[PDB]
Design an enzyme around this catalytic site. Structure first.
Site, PDB file in Angstrom:
ATOM      1  N   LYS A 112      -8.966  39.739  75.774  1.00 33.50           N
ATOM      2  CA  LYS A 112     -10.318  39.765  76.143  1.00 33.50           C
ATOM      3  C   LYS A 112     -11.293  40.152  74.952  1.00 33.50           C
ATOM      4  CE  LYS A 112      -9.639  39.257  80.897  1.00 33.50           C
ATOM      5  NZ  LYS A 112      -8.417  38.111  80.855  1.00 33.50           N
ATOM      6  N   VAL A 133     -23.532  44.874 100.619  1.00 34.04           N
ATOM      7  CA  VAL A 133     -23.989  45.446 101.818  1.00 34.04           C
ATOM      8  C   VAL A 133     -23.181  46.459 102.101  1.00 34.04           C
ATOM      9  CG1 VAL A 133     -24.657  44.726 103.958  1.00 34.04           C
ATOM     10  CG2 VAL A 133     -25.381  43.265 101.897  1.00 34.04           C
TER      11      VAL A 133
HETATM   12 NA    NA Z   1     -19.854  47.087 100.586  1.00 31.30          NA
END
Ligand code: NA
Ligand code: NA
Length: 327
Positions: free
Chosen positions: A66, A97
DNA sequence: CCGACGTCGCATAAGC
DNA sequence: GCTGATGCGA
DNA sequence: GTCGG
């Protein structure tokens, strides 16, 4: 250890890390990529080839490749592709979240819920934790300046002591080691009346008190020994209000307290070294106890600990200030 | 070649 | 209702 | 994905 020395590479590795965790549900590939990211982040030369990087513990053939592609083109084809992928980039994001992890993210995005907005339109599909996460999405991604931490600490130690002057409480984490900023506050709590052998109310009254003076504003989770929730410093007069912050409070029994304190002070790297040390001196150390071995490896009964130093003594190590536990 | 890679308390699911 | 699995965060 | 028995 200088920022954009291999920033391009480490931001790369870190992006791939998140996609492994959040989209692929491959937590171990996630830690591989992060570990690579670390050891490269500490490397004090601008990396010139994948082969140069491969020499490092945790950089293998695939990542080496990579880096070569990134070095020659300034990008990675796979990363560029996954970034423009509607489904995947939304799964990766939604996990930001708190309370939404890779499984719930995946389900949301299945039913067309991909944005904060979409979450807001669908609160009836969020559990308690997740609603808190949404509500404070921005606040929770903010760092906590050390001065605010000190202020938060004043409030925590004060109210714990006023519930019972015999309680002991320690703010650990990167805070205890001197960090100019923290991700959250991690409080460790004990009482002389709570031993491994040993009321079922010690954590609750402390949390209640912190709610009564409006320091603790929300609860993600709460049981007999671990509390996880939300807090906030009192808004100065007419000044702009403070961010809501994450705080955990852990009740540990007294005869396991300093092992707990040692462990949750870290850093992770320092812990690995010290648990390594440690074995060689004839002991096993975990978050709870230090036990002796054992000519065949059979762990004996846990030894008495009454301070952080006590632990260091057992294993022939002069006490090291939280200040100097970076490794 | 192939398994380990940290572990665990708490909320909630899910099968019974 | 019970159970103890699974998701989550640390 | 990387390391190691
Ligand atoms: Na989370
Ligand atoms: Na290597």
């Amino acid at each position: 250890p200088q920022e954009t020395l291999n920033g391009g590479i480490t931001d790369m590795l870190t992006e791939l890390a998140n996609f492994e965790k959040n989209v692929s549900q491959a937590i171990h590939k996630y830690n591989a990529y992060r570990k690579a990211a670390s050891v490269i982040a500490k490397y004090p030369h601008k990396i010139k080839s994948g082969a140069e990087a491969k020499k490092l513990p945790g950089v293998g053939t695939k990542i080496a490749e990579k880096i070569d592609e990134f070095l020659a083109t300034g990008k990675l084809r796979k990363l560029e592709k996954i970034r423009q992928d509607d489904t995947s980039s939304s799964i990766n994001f939604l996990t930001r979240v708190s309370g939404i992890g890779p499984s719930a993210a995946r389900k949301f995005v299945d039913e067309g819920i991909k944005t904060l907005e979409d979450l807001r339109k669908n609160e009836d599909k969020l559990n308690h934790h997740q609603r808190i996460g949404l509500k404070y999405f921005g606040d929770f991604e903010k760092r906590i300046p050390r001065e605010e931490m000190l202020q938060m600490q004043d409030i925590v130690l004060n109210e714990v002591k006023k519930v019972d002057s015999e309680y002991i409480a320690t703010v650990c984490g990167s805070f205890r080691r001197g960090a100019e900023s923290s991700g959250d506050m991690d409080v460790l709590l004990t009482h002389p009346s709570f031993t491994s052998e040993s009321q079922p109310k010690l954590l609750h009254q402390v949390v209640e008190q912190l709610q009564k003076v409006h320091f603790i504003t929300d609860t993600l989770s709460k049981g007999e020994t671990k509390f996880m929730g939300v807090c906030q410093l009192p808004s100065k007069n007419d000044e702009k209000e403070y961010p809501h912050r994450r705080i955990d409070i852990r009740l540990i029994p007294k005869d396991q307290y300093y092992c707990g304190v040692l462990y949750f002070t870290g850093s992770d790297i320092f812990n690995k070294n010290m648990r390594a040390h440690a074995l060689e001196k004839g002991f096993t150390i975990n978050e709870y106890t230090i036990r002796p071995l054992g000519v065949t490896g059979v762990a004996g009964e846990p030894l008495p600990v009454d301070s952080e130093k006590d632990i260091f003594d057992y294993i022939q190590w002069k006490y090291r200030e939280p200040k100097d536990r970076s490794e």
